[PDB]
Design a protein around this ligand. Structure first.
Ligand SMILES: Nc1ncnc2c1ncn2[C@@H]1O[C@H](COP(=O)(O)O)[C@@H](O)[C@H]1O
Ligand SMILES: *Cc1c(COP(=O)(O)O)cnc(C)c1O
Length: 806
């Protein structure tokens, strides 16, 4: 291989010319950067051609607007999409360095927070792999969300300085800079509408390449960085200047801030993307090779990932009507046609709203436009449904209450040609209840796009073991098209293949066990069940339900210490919101139970509790390839979809969960007999809510529940602070809105079936091979082809990029 040789040549010249350092003064970070730069060079060749090919063969451009972009680590994905993974592994070894060591040096891209963020990052790869003409638009947050640190068993927020040493992937484009306008006043001149006396913030773009698997199509991600305009002056004009400089800087500083009026910043953040993005979008349309804006809805697609970029609608109206001199009605039919919405937040309350006063002050022009839109619309409603006063209020963009407020979700539907849902079941609720009146008027608008996960990151990267077990028995083709996993369905009875499936899982379990032993300092039993419950630390996610399970499990080994019980390694990961009092207590409860269960000799190795500190995109790639059991035990009627569960199924993990969200469509895809479904279903939940839930009906009338709960309340797990979980008890007893005790029995007797199925080796791995065979639907490429066809009006892989030279 001359590849292995070539990688070694460029690494040295990068270290010597780009980094300007010799091996004698180079840190492992200097070694990562030199490697990262070598891998980036191979992307550049495609990138330049891909972006010039789009200018040349002018296709319709897709624009994914999102605040969240949970990208994670780039190096590994980049060299796998380039096939150099093996050549680099050999070349890095040849330089007396470990690739795995360098990969761990790389920081997590502090651009996401949860499911919405990863959704974006997966989608971005799929569009690239499917040869699409797409772009990712977002904010270049400098400090991300935060780093989780468990101090004395509690969560401590640490600042994420992931840009301290700088990203070796992103390329700054200060020449493509744009102005974002704020505050000021409006004026109606004979020429047009003019927005003057405005405060200006600079938008500086940073582009990061998005490579496609195998294909020469490498897209671009434009993330904007807030900067302030430069310059006689007094103290009053010095202090305001130095303050304004910094205030602009904290727009692209931290994701989802609280500060209490850090609300205006969150609004400012949204308009910073919207304005910057759209000006750049339009610029590309008019800067295209060879009255002008008629071809706009045929050459531009704008997907509004949740209510965050809801301002794109009145902003596009603004730019077209006030700047481009376009007719309102012409520009409005364009707006509707060039905009598509997606709703993740189920039930009409988590739906984003903003006071009119706050809009009156910050975006006075956008308010006029929104007011105008929410009239030409209401008048059309008064045409179809005359005299219906209560429909008008139910459908208005402007809401009433303690003060007038603009419902951004209404504006998203009124302004979009297609509104979609994340899961079939969820999507129906969006139609039938969330936007009931908008649905009747236009049912053809409302759609569904079931979410997906990229098979490269969530399989080829993290679990190459399981991948190669499918590669030689099917052929690589399954990586392009995931539905080809049903081709291994007749291998449910193949004797040589079944043991080779568990061979991979165990070869992964040991690697993660070593990580667990080294980092957390606990004796890990690899022969035990790898129970996992990694997600947002929230009450509706029911982390406490899994707690109660391990409490009874601990008491069962204390009751019958002789009994040969099924060994486990209960893993609960995730992060609590900084203000969330209850979720912080929940993290403490897990650590309190662990400091009891792990530090006990009667228990030994048949039970280990371990809270996963700093659950990220990098950590998920470690835990999921080595996980036996997967928990998605959320209260039914809450989880809309969820993408986590999908990563497990593909990596050979039996899921436990209620009949809600992604669980419904998985049990539909693989059969409810092949998944540990338990607890109340949506209607039973509805019925219990009709009954009027009481906790004492469950606490007084149970043996091992009473024990487990009065253990927590007594302070059996917090001996030095016996009243530590007072608020946890008081909740589960009086103000528990996610019926935790109502699914206690159901969860445990379900867990008994889980316990017995794992007692048998072949029948567990047989039920597992069903899950891997049915995961095909849950491909991100499937969702992207569905967006490209049912919404964006584009042909997948119709425009392919040829191999260039120099
Ligand atoms: N006049 C032009 N001739 C050839 N390529 C261009 C031109 N303008 C832009 N491009 C391509 O488009 C990319 C950057 O422009 P944009 O797509 O507008 O961000 C570069 O990769 C260029 O190769
Ligand atoms: C996949 C993923 C999620 C989403 O999982 P859910 O169960 O849908 O909440 C969240 N966070 C990280 C870091 C992930 O990798």
């Amino acid at each position: 291989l001359g590849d292995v040789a070539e990688v070694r040549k460029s690494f040295n010249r990068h270290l010597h010319f780009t980094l300007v350092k010799d091996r004698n003064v180079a840190t492992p970070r200097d070694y990562f950067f030199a490697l990262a730069h070598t891998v980036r060079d191979h992307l550049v060749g495609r990138w330049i051609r891909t972006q010039q090919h789009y200018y040349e063969r002018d296709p319709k451009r897709i624009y994914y607007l999102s605040l969240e972009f949970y990208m994670g680590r780039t190096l590994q994905n980049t060299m796998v999409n380039l096939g150099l993974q093996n050549a680099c592994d050999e070349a890095i070894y040849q330089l007396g360095l470990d690739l795995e060591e360098l990969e761990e040096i790389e920081e997590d891209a502090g651009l996401g927070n949860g499911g919405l963020g990863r959704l974006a990052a997966c989608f971005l790869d799929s569009m690239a792999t499917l040869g699409l003409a797409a772009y990712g638009y977002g904010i270049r947050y400098e400090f991300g969300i935060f780093n989780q640190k468990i101090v004395n068993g509690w969560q401590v927020e640490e600042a994420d300085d992931w840009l301290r040493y700088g990203n070796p992937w992103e390329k700054a484009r200060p020449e493509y800079m744009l102005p974002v306008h704020f505050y000021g006043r409006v004026e109606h001149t004979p020429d047009g509408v003019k927005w003057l006396d405005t405060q200006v913030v600079l938008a500086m773009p940073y582009d990061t390449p998005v490579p496609g698997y195998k294909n020469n199509t490498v897209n671009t991600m434009r993330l904007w960085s807030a900067k302030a305009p430069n310059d006689d002056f007094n103290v009053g004009d010095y202090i305001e200047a130095v303050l304004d400089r910094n205030l602009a800087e904290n727009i692209s500083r931290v994701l989802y801030p609280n500060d209490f009026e850090g609300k205006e910043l969150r609004l400012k953040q949204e308009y910073f993307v919207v304005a910057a993005t759209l000006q750049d979008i339009i610029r590309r349309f008019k800067s295209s090779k060879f009255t002008c804006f008629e071809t706009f809805p045929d050459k531009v697609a704008i997907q509004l990932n949740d209510t965050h970029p809801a301002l794109s609608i009145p902003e596009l109206m603004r730019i077209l009507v006030d700047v481009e001199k376009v007719d309102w009605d012409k520009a409005w039919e364009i707006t509707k046609k060039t905009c598509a919405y997606t709703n993740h937040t189920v039930l009409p309350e988590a739906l984003e709203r903003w006071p009119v006063s706050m809009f009156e002050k910050l975006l006075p022009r956008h308010l006029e436009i929104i007011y105008a839109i929410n009239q030409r619309h209401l008048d059309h409603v008064a045409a179809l449904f005359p005299g219906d006063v209560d429909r008008l209020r139910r459908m208005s963009v402007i809401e009433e209450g303690d003060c007038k407020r603009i419902n951004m979700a209404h504006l998203c539907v009124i302004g979009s040609h297609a509104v979609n849902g994340v899961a079939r079941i969820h999507s129906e609720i969006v139609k039938q209840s969330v936007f009931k009146d908008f649905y009747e008027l236009e049912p053809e608008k409302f759609q569904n796009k079931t979410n997906g996960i990229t098979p490269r990151r969530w399989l080829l990267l993290c679990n190459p073991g399981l991948a190669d077990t499918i590669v030689e028995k099917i052929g690589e083709e399954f990586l392009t098209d995931l539905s080809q996993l049903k081709k291994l369905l007749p291998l449910v009875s193949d004797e040589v293949f079944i043991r080779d499936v568990a061979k991979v899982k165990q070869e992964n379990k040991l690697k993660f066990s070593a990580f667990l032993e080294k980092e957390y300092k606990v004796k890990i039993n690899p022969s035990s069940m790898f129970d996992v419950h990694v997600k947002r630390i929230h009450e509706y996610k029911r982390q406490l339900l899994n707690c109660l399970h391990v409490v009874t499990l601990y008491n069962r080994i204390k009751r019958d210490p002789a009994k040969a019980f099924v060994p486990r390694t209960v893993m609960i990961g995730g992060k609590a919101a900084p203000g969330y009092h209850m979720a912080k207590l929940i993290i403490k409860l897990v650590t309190s139970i662990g400091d009891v269960v792990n530090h006990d000799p009667v228990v030994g190795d048949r039970l280990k509790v371990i809270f996963l500190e700093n659950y990220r995109v990098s950590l998920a790639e470690k835990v999921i390839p080595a996980a036996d059991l997967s928990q998605q035990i959320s209260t039914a009627g809450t989880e809309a979809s969820g993408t986590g569960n999908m990563k497990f199924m593909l990596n050979g993990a039996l899921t436990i969960g209620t009949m809600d969200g992604a669980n419904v469509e998985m049990a539909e895809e693989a059969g409810a007999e092949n998944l540990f479904i338990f607890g109340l279903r949506v209607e039973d939940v509805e019925a219990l809510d009709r009954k009027g839930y009481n906790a004492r009906e469950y606490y007084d009338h149970l043996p091992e529940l009473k024990q487990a709960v009065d253990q927590i309340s007594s302070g059996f797990f917090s001996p030095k602070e016996p009243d530590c979980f007072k608020d946890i008890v008081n909740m589960l007893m009086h103000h528990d809105r996610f019926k935790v005790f109502a699914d206690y029995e159901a969860y445990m007797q379900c867990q008994a079936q889980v316990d017995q199925l794992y007692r048998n080796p072949k029948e567990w791995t047989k039920k597992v091979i069903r899950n891997i065979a049915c995961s095909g639907k849950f491909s991100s490429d499937r969702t992207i082809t569905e967006y490209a066809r049912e919404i964006w009006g584009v042909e997948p892989s119709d425009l392919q990029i040829p191999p260039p030279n120099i």
